[PDB]
């Protein structure tokens, strides 16, 4: 089974199921950075 690895800068979204509204959005460039 293939390895899907978030080990490089990536973008993401937190969505509310009903409204479909973007509660949160962010980019991780370096975890050890906050």
């Amino acid at each position: 089974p293939p390895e899907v690895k978030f080990n490089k800068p990536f973008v993401f979204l937190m969505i509310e199921q009903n409204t479909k509204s973007p509660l949160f959005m962010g980019k991780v460039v370096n975890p050890t950075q906050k």
């Binding site: 973008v11 370096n30 975890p31």
Partner: protein, 336 residues
């Protein structure tokens, strides 16, 4: 899907892009909905092009949706958000801090109460410490200890402070096992690799390839009415991804329910975003409300006010159990 969702999503990408252009190589995190809620609420007390720049700045289009329905959209949105599934924890609230002796416009007060479930408080901005103590506490309680001291320095001339917050605490539908969390390399840039605690689980995932984004999209399901979407851009395609994001493209994703077998590696993480949105909001078209031409006569008909500061802070925690996130807005008004 809330009538005003598409716009909120387009505001998120619009705002995100301004932020990623402001600082190129740093972690970003904010709450589009929170920011949109505070400013849509604010517009109510504005007029003319001051008022229109805000609505247009939030990606709203009056020919597509009448103003009355816009606020009505938020009204239901806040209502829905505050009515999560038993397994999910999610709250959002609005507090309007008004100075002592400020002669508010009756309509504004009633509009913000009805349409934005806003709580009115009276505070003396002359007693700076006291004023701060109250705002940060209201924020801390709403964010259950996640966001403390949102306001470190409060200007004595402040006429009112519009404060909004969102709290989130969701659990993974299928969580990671702590014992599988080992340290792995995270590739920051060509010459920068760093070890970070990397969670992992072998299971069935919603993984789709979005050619239009040259990225792979991962859908993580929370126990309840929440979902997190992760975008993994192809080599050198990060900017392209940020650039190509749209609501249509996203909406199409969630529309796909196909799952596949994979070994997921997701970084445990803790990131905090703290911004002054006055600049990035300007790039969006929102300027007059911060200027000497600002029209807030809808909030008060006695003195002409204006917004001097647009503060946003959001905190994100992601681990094996799920995700905790908080967002809070501090918009301060002063004599213009």
């Amino acid at each position: 899907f809330n009538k005003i969702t598409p716009n909120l999503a387009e505001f998120a990408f619009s705002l995100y892009r301004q932020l990623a252009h402001q600082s190129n190589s740093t972690n970003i995190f904010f709450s589009p909905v929170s920011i949109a809620t505070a400013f849509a609420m604010l517009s109510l007390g504005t007029k003319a092009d001051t008022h229109d720049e805000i609505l247009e700045g939030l990606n709203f289009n009056l020919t597509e949706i009448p103003e009355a329905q816009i606020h009505e959209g938020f009204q239901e949105l806040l209502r829905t958000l505050n009515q999560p599934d038993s397994q999910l924890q999610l709250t959002t609230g609005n507090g309007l801090f008004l100075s002592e002796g400020l002669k508010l416009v009756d309509k504004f007060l009633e509009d913000v109460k009805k349409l934005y479930h806003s709580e009115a408080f009276t505070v003396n901005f002359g007693d700076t410490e006291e004023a701060k103590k109250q705002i940060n506490d209201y924020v801390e309680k709403g964010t259950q200890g996640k966001i403390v001291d949102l306001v470190k320095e409060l200007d004595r001339d402040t006429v009112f402070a519009l404060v909004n917050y969102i709290f989130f605490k969701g659990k993974w539908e299928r969580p990671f096992e702590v014992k599988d969390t080992e340290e792995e390399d995270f590739h920051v840039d060509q010459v920068t690799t760093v070890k970070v605690p990397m969670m992992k689980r072998l299971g069935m995932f919603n993984i789709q390839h979005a050619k239009k984004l040259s990225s792979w999209v991962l859908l993580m399901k929370y126990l309840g009415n929440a979902t997190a979407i992760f975008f993994l851009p192809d080599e050198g395609k990060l900017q392209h991804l940020e650039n190509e994001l749209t609501h249509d493209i996203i909406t199409k994703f969630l529309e796909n329910e196909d799952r596949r077998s994979a070994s997921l590696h997701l970084p445990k993480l803790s990131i905090t975003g703290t911004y002054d949105l006055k600049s990035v909001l300007g790039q969006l078209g929102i300027t007059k409300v911060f200027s000497n031409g600002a029209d807030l006569s809808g909030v008060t008909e006695e003195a002409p006010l204006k917004l001097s500061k647009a503060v946003h802070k959001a905190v994100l925690t992601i681990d094996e159990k799920g995700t905790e996130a908080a967002g809070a807005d501090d918009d301060e008004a002063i004599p213009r």
